[PDB]
Write a protein that binds this DNA or RNA. Structure first.
Ligand SMILES: [Zn+2]
Lengths: 121, 49, 454, 126, 102, 171, 134
RNA sequence: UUGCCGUUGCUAUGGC
């Protein structure tokens, strides 16, 4: 067991990154570590994606404890660069969060990814 | 015909707050309190058989 | 066996549809249409041109004259060239400057001629999407395209404009906005020997223009992510690739129809295929194209794939999995923050977070036997496609280009059996769309020219 | 998921309707039929005239619940476990049980009528 | 600014003619503007403006494109010979009215 | 379309109340039309289940039905089984219409704002301006629902109210 | 007896057996692409009609090919249009949902009777089926 | 050979 433990393999990683890109287009993604912990303590979050290769790792390992407290799925993508590119911004991000919405046109996709990463976790 | 069903559904989902207790979306800001009262005598839970 | 029964019943079905070689084999409608074919005109643009320049193993590779002319522009982004039937080249940067070069002095480095630098002066005084008719670029010029006849260069970027500059003076003759808020252009390609431009805009849209008439022909829709690259030849077909939908489409633009080609490599079946006796996996995002001829093309992916596709097969014909290597893993003095090397090594998880270089530039020489791939591995790769057109293979490398290769294209010289080319490649220290790129390992913002011979 | 009782089974066999196939072409959905232990106790207590009905209720396609009470009053058991939970269709032909079930709200009621099953308080049948 | 595209250009020597299909492109304009289209066609091909003709115009839904049928002649006299009289009334010079009785 | 069996029971009335209010429908005929053809769809899929495995009808019409249901978009890509066609229902069908989709994509503030945007022609999927609200967008036309370029909520010239107010304030 | 020239037996029928489930499976397992339109270009009356079905866009492509091929507009011929356009659009809004026709699932027509289960290669001998396999 | 700056060559490199 490493610190960044529940890492996803390549198929789950690309499923995660595709729904991250679609939520970023639909304004349902809060990107960055402290925005992610803000939306996590506010409770509007469906799952959090941490990238398992940033330059420290505890910098985002603070978030699994918060997700565990509030029972939110969390998953580790192995590329901060690809995560930022999926988020649609011109920088690497290390953590992102899918906020809850019921007037959301990708709710089935988000729920399927939640089920996959929760059976992983 | 469309605005009538817009305004009899708004009436219906305002009546639904009376019969059930509707999940409004969770805690908005700081937890202020129950804002309406706490009854220590009433138990609104379904007993079995 | 249900799929066996499906295949069997489909075979019986096709046999029955046939039901509902002799010495005489002539069909009246076919020969009548062939009489109309003998009657018609314009066997010029619509050549279904196959690969007629078979010269991959012929020319030299290992001793190219490689000059990396460094320029003082932050993050060069595109390269456009020109040959008539003196040669000029064009570069453009993230510093909002277009720069004209002369390149025809073949044995030496290119020569700067003229700047054209937009800036904060060109921000429109409206913030209103159809009075975007200014005369310069105020944000992030992403692509240049020279005319096949050479009257104009046409450029555009994240300011959702197409500015068409004259060649002889680098002056903006005409401005055409893309009339909506997300309408950033990402790739431009003229169809060859023409005046028709194909721009690929991030509205999942492809706009087409006639430049010498200052008119827009046709807007054509249908990708699912941003159309990251475009490619065209002398035919009125076009080939675009959207980024994350992992499909490449090709467009009959007069018919406004398309052929889609999805990817579809899975590490489950691929690791089983290796398990019959290994760090290779699925696909991120198809990124770059170049139409090699009018029956085949090649795609550069996000997991370092280079794939070769035909016009007659949905799934790709040939793959090449790792084309520029896998990236150097982040150091133990920059992963963890513990004290001991054992825990800082445990925070690498072995091989699980090694990510491959992604091919950020691909150029097929038109109708030829050889294409060039480039990323930030430092070394361009040259590949030739086999003469049966079902595979390609690495010839050699061009290792004098330190940085990301934001553009590759070649410039021809020499006659039908003796040839020499200079491969231009725009080199930056930052990807042409966003930043995202750490470990800048000795990169410089320059033009890597190579002179290849024979 | 549909709770069966004894007169629904008897009327199914008297009208020659299969249980799971009659349920499926009534609702146009996939059904899970449930025999409570009190309905099974009632079918067994019906005697050796109803052997056909008992060993058609003994069917692996018909799943079965485990009621935890004294006595075998299936109408009480069905009414209690449906007004507790509201995730059940009640298939019945008793007039009294039909009136109880259609007086408690949100509970769809299925019944043998004619030569196939009918459903009433389920508002999405077509 | 209107835009022009010829496709499938064949030659009819029996009718001394060259014929083709005409994709006419007018983004943010109403329609084909047929006389201006004959001008644009007569200048993209050779001169013969009273020998170029278009007849079959169908605009697709939402505007922009329209497919027409273009036929261009040499020799305006033999164009007058070979074209029909209603199209000559529409575009060129001929005008003979029918006798209105019964 | 066709009317239901018992059209006036209170569960059906509260059903239609929730459906018309949650999806901005004008009358009962929207629900009844889309439910009539859904009834045909899963009445067919019931027969495809009542025949056996390796039946030619079941194999070919089953994968045909689930593939064109996935391409309409009411069925996701991974559930390629034929019992999910039975689990399908009416709001899975009228979440696919253009009014619902315009509101969910966020070009409008409610389903009624979406209905008036569609009927005032500010919405175009792909190339063509769609102008009826009950359109049933597909899984490939799901991402090209945007504002029409002929409309002031796109980038076009502003309408008559805005330009008349600008002219009168210029006077 | 004697021969008699039968165009109904050397005419290309190919439509008694053209079933949409088999054709859809062939389009799935075809391994060559399918010429689909740019996505807005195939809806018809701003959505007042359907999208258009695959048979309708095939027929439209045939009509425009014949159209350009011999330079003639088709017409508003009353009997054929009052049959075909009105009956076609009414069964289109009946059975075509979102560009996909679901009319076939509501139609009794046996697949294996006409379109499968080969009649010429019926192999009514043990030896003929043995030679057809090997 | 450039936005600066260093080695420079009497041309190539490397730090922002
Ligand atoms: Zn019981």
């Amino acid at each position: 067991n490493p610190k960044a433990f529940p890492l996803a393999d390549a198929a789950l990683t690309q499923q995660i990154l595709d729904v991250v890109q679609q939520a970023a287009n639909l304004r349902q993604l809060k990107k960055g570590a402290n925005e992610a912990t803000k939306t996590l303590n506010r409770g509007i979050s469906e799952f959090i994606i941490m990238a398992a290769d940033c330059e420290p790792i505890e910098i985002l390992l603070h978030l699994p404890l918060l997700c565990e407290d509030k029972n939110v799925p969390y998953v580790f993508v192995p590329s901060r660069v690809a995560l930022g590119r999926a988020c649609g911004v011109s920088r690497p991000v290390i953590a992102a969060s899918i906020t809850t919405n019921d007037a959301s046109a990708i709710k089935t996709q988000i729920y399927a990814v939640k089920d996959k990463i929760e059976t992983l976790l | 015909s469309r605005v009538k069903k817009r305004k009899k559904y708004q009436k219906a989902q305002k009546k639904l707050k009376s019969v059930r207790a509707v999940y409004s979306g969770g805690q908005s800001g700081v937890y202020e309190g129950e804002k309406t009262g706490i009854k220590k005598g009433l138990t609104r839970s379904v007993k079995f058989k | 066996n249900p799929a066996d029964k499906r295949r069997r019943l489909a075979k019986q079905y096709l046999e029955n549809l046939k039901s509902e070689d002799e010495y005489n084999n002539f069909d009246a409608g076919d020969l009548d249409k062939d009489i109309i074919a003998s009657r018609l005109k314009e066997d010029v643009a619509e050549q279904q041109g196959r690969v007629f320049r078979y010269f991959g193993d012929k020319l030299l590779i290992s001793e190219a004259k490689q000059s990396f002319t460094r320029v003082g522009e932050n993050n060069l982004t595109c390269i456009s060239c020109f040959q008539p039937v003196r040669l000029f080249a064009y570069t453009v940067s993230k510093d909002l400057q277009l720069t004209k070069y002369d390149i025809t002095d073949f044995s030496k480095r290119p020569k700067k001629l003229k700047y054209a630098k937009g800036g904060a002066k060109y921000i429109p005084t409206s913030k209103h999407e159809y009075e975007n008719t200014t005369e310069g670029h105020y944000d992030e010029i992403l692509t240049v395209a020279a005319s096949p006849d050479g009257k104009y260069v046409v450029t555009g970027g994240r300011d959702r404009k197409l500015i068409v500059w004259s060649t002889e003076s680098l002056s903006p003759v005409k401005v055409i906005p893309t009339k909506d808020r997300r309408g950033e252009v990402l790739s431009l390609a003229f169809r060859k020997n023409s005046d028709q431009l194909y721009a690929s805009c991030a509205d999942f849209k492809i706009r087409t223009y006639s430049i010498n008439q200052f008119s827009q022909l046709e807007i054509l829709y249908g990708h699912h992510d941003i159309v990251e690259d475009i490619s065209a030849l002398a035919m009125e077909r076009c080939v675009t690739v959207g980024a994350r939908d992992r499909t490449a489409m090709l467009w009959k633009i007069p018919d406004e129809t398309r052929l889609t080609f999805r990817g579809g490599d899975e590490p489950q079946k691929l690791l089983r295929r290796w398990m019959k006796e290994p760090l290779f996996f699925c696909e991120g995002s198809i990124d770059v194209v170049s139409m090699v001829d009018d029956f085949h093309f090649i795609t550069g992916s996000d997991n370092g794939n280079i794939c070769l596709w035909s016009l007659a097969k949905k799934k790709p014909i040939f793959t090449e999995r790792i084309a520029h290597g896998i990236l150097p893993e982040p150091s133990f003095n920059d992963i963890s923050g513990e004290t001991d090397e054992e825990l800082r090594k445990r925070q690498l998880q072995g091989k699980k977070l090694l990510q491959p270089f992604w091919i950020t530039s691909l150029y097929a020489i038109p109708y030829s036997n050889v294409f060039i791939s480039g990323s930030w591995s430092g070394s361009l790769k040259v590949w030739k496609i086999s003469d049966n057109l079902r595979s390609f293979e690495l010839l050699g490398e061009l290792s004098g280009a330190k940085g990301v290769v934001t553009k590759i294209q070649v410039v021809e010289s020499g006659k039908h059996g003796k040839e020499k080319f200079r491969i231009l490649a725009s080199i930056a220290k930052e990807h042409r769309l966003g930043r995202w790129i750490a470990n800048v390992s000795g990169a410089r913002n320059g033009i890597y020219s190579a002179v290849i011979d024979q | 998921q549909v709770l069966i009782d004894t007169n629904f089974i008897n009327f199914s066999i008297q009208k020659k309707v299969d249980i799971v196939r009659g349920m499926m072409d009534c609702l146009l959905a996939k059904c899970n039929p449930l025999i409570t232990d009190c309905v099974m106790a009632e079918l067994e207590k019906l005697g050796p005239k109803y052997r056909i009905a008992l060993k058609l209720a003994r069917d692996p396609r018909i799943k079965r619940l485990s009621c935890s009470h004294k006595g075998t009053y299936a109408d009480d058991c069905l009414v209690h476990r449906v007004l507790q939970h509201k995730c059940y269709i009640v298939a019945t032909n008793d007039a009294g049980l039909k009136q109880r079930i259609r007086k408690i709200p949100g509970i769809p009621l299925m019944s043998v009528g004619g030569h196939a099953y009918v459903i009433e308080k389920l508002p999405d049948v077509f | 600014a209107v835009t022009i595209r010829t496709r499938k250009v064949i030659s009819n020597p029996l009718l001394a003619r060259k014929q083709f299909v005409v994709d006419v492109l007018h983004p943010n304009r109403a329609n084909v503007s047929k006389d201006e289209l004959r001008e644009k066609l007569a200048e993209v091909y050779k001169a013969e403006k009273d020998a170029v003709s278009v007849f079959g115009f169908r605009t697709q839904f939402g505007g922009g494109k329209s497919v027409g049928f273009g036929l261009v002649y040499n020799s305006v006299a033999e164009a007058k010979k070979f074209e029909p009289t209603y199209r000559l009334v529409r575009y060129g010079l001929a005008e003979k009215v029918e006798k209105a009785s019964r | 379309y066709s009317t239901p069996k018992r059209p006036y029971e209170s569960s059906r009335l509260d059903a239609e109340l929730k459906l018309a209010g949650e999806f901005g429908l004008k009358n009962k005929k929207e629900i009844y039309r889309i439910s009539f053809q859904l009834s045909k769809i899963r009445r067919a899929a019931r027969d495809l289940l009542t025949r056996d495995e390796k039946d030619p009808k079941r194999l070919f019409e089953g994968n045909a039905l689930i593939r064109r249901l996935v391409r309409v978009g009411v069925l996701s890509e991974d559930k390629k089984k034929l019992d999910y066609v039975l689990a399908l229902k009416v709001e899975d069908f009228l979440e696919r219409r253009l009014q619902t989709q315009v509101y969910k994509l966020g070009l409008a503030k409610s389903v009624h704002h979406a209905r008036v945007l569609i009927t005032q022609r500010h919405i175009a999927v792909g190339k063509q301006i769609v102008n009826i609200p009950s359109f049933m967008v597909r899984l490939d036309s799901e991402k090209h629902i945007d504002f029409a370029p002929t409309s002031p909520f796109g980038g076009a010239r502003p309408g008559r109210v805005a330009r008349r107010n600008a002219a009168r304030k210029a006077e | 007896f004697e021969d008699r020239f039968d165009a109904r037996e050397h005419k290309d029928r190919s439509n008694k057996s053209r079933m949409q489930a088999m054709e859809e499976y062939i389009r799935e397992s075809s391994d060559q692409p399918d010429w689909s339109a740019s996505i807005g270009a195939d809806i018809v009356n701003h959505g007042r009609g359907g999208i258009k079905s695959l048979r309708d866009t095939e027929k439209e492509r045939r009509v425009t090919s014949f159209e350009e091929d011999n330079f003639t507009r088709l017409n508003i011929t009353n009997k054929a249009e009052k049959r075909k356009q009105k009956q076609r659009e009414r069964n289109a809004r009946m059975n075509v949902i979102g560009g996909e026709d679901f009319g076939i699932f509501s139609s009794k027509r046996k697949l294996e009777d006409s379109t499968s289960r080969r009649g010429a290669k019926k192999t009514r001998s043990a030896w003929d089926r043995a030679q057809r396999r090997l």
